[PDB]
């Protein structure tokens, strides 16, 4: 009928409509810290989120997304393993029904409670739709969320979820500052991969941050109260919207730290 994360249309079934699911550079993967190569030539990451304009938040039946105005270079990502400027277009989360699962990427087989993806596209390509047609079209900055203390920067997002409860609802979400979702250190691992949901396009340079952010259980708890279904349909709680780790194949994960 259409992809989802349940018994009948979950990740295991995705390959039927999206053949690329069994490709060479699929994500997410398991980061084995003892095999990752320290690379002294990688540049430090440069995140310029000082003029970001958030527009709205919407429930799309797969997760919730905060969209930004990417008409010009207001919020960008440069440095690290990248070439050229990438524009912030949207961020979303993946989470679980329990605190010991939720993240897509794992560290030494360790699963975190949730995972934040800040999606950017390569400006040299003109618009998002063109960028998705290239090997170095996307750069997704991933951050792990660990349950502990509350993150002030996340509360604004948490407070508005009630107005976008079911599939297809949206609420205006202006003046949100993304810099509030960053950890202290910008150290990372990097590898060539893909989107973690259909169409599963292999156009992503993944930059996973080493240091996770803290989020209270009450904050994550509100994520689990969202709905996969639209208004009027039977209720199905939005939880465990994450894809299992894929085989690394012939790839190498470089670390920007020792
Ligand atoms: N989890 S993830 O980081 O690996 C991403 C999954 C998707 C990302 S990133 S996305 O931002 O690139 N894109 C997306 C999602 C919501 C809004 C938007 O403008 C784009 C879609 C749906 N998208 C339709 C057009 O072709 C590519 C895929 C899925
Ligand atoms: Hg691509
Ligand atoms: Zn994602």
The one catalytic residue among 1, 62, 105, 120: 62
Rounded distance, CA 125 to CA 24, Å?
24
The alpha carbon dihedral of 95, 101, 105, 110 has a sign of: positive
Is 1-258 in CATH node 3.10.200.10?
A: yes
Is residue 34 annotated as involved in ligand binding?
Answer: no
Ligand 1 environment, Cβ below 6 A: 65, 89-90, 117, 119, 132, 140, 195-197, 199
The phi and psi torsions of 47 (rounded to 5 degrees) equal -110, 110
Is residue 197 annotated as involved in ligand binding?
Answer: yes
Task: Tell me, yes or no, if 62 is annotated catalytic.
Answer: yes
Resolution of this structure in Å:
2.0
Ligand 1 atom at minimal distance to the Cα of residue 199: 28
Ligand 1 atom at minimal distance to the Cα of residue 140: 3
- Map residue 231 onto helix, strand or coil: coil
Q: Which two tokens stand for residue 72?
A: 């010009």
C-alpha distances out from residue 144 to 84, 131, 137, 153, Å: 26, 26, 23, 15
Burial class (CB in 10 A: 0-12, 13-18, 19+), 93: buried
Ligand 1 atom at minimal distance to the Cα of residue 198: 29
For ligand 3, the distance from its centroid to the CA atom of residue 103, given in whole angstroms, is 9
- Map residue 156 onto helix, strand or coil: helix
**In sequence order, what E strands does the chain have?**
30-31, 37-38, 45-48, 54-59, 64-68, 76-79, 86-95, 106-107, 114-122, 138-147, 170-172, 188-193, 204-209, 213-215, 254-255
């Amino acid at each position: 009928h259409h992809w989802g994360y349940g018994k009948h249309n979950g990740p295991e079934h995705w390959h039927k409509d999206f053949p690329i699911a069994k490709g060479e550079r699929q994500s997410p993967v398991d980061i084995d810290t003892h095999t990752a190569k320290y690379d002294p030539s990688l540049k430090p990451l440069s995140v310029s989120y000082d003029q970001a304009t958030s527009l709205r938040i919407l429930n799309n039946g797969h997760a919730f997304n905060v969209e930004f105005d990417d008409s010009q270079d207001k919020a960008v990502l440069k440095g690290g393993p990248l070439d050229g400027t990438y524009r912030l277009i949207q961020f979303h989360f993946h989470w679980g029904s329990l605190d010991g699962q939720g993240s897509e990427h794992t560290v030494d087989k360790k699963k975190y409670a949730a995972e934040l993806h800040l999606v950017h596209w390569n400006t040299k390509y003109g618009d998002f739709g063109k960028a998705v047609q290239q090997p170095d079209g996307l750069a997704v900055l991933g951050i792990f969320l660990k349950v502990g203390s509350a993150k002030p920067g996340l509360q604004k997002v948490v407070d508005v979820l009630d107005s976008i409860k079911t599939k297809g609802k949206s609420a205006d979400f202006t003046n949100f500052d993304p810099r509030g979702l960053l950890p202290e250190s910008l150290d990372y691992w990097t590898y060539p991969g893909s989107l973690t949901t259909p169409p599963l396009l292999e156009c992503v340079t993944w930059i996973v941050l080493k240091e996770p952010i803290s989020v209270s259980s009450e904050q994550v708890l509100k994520f689990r109260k969202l709905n996969f279904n639209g208004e009027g349909e039977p209720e199905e709680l939005m939880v465990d919207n994450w894809r299992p780790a894929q085989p690394l194949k012939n790839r190498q994960i470089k670390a920007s730290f020792k």
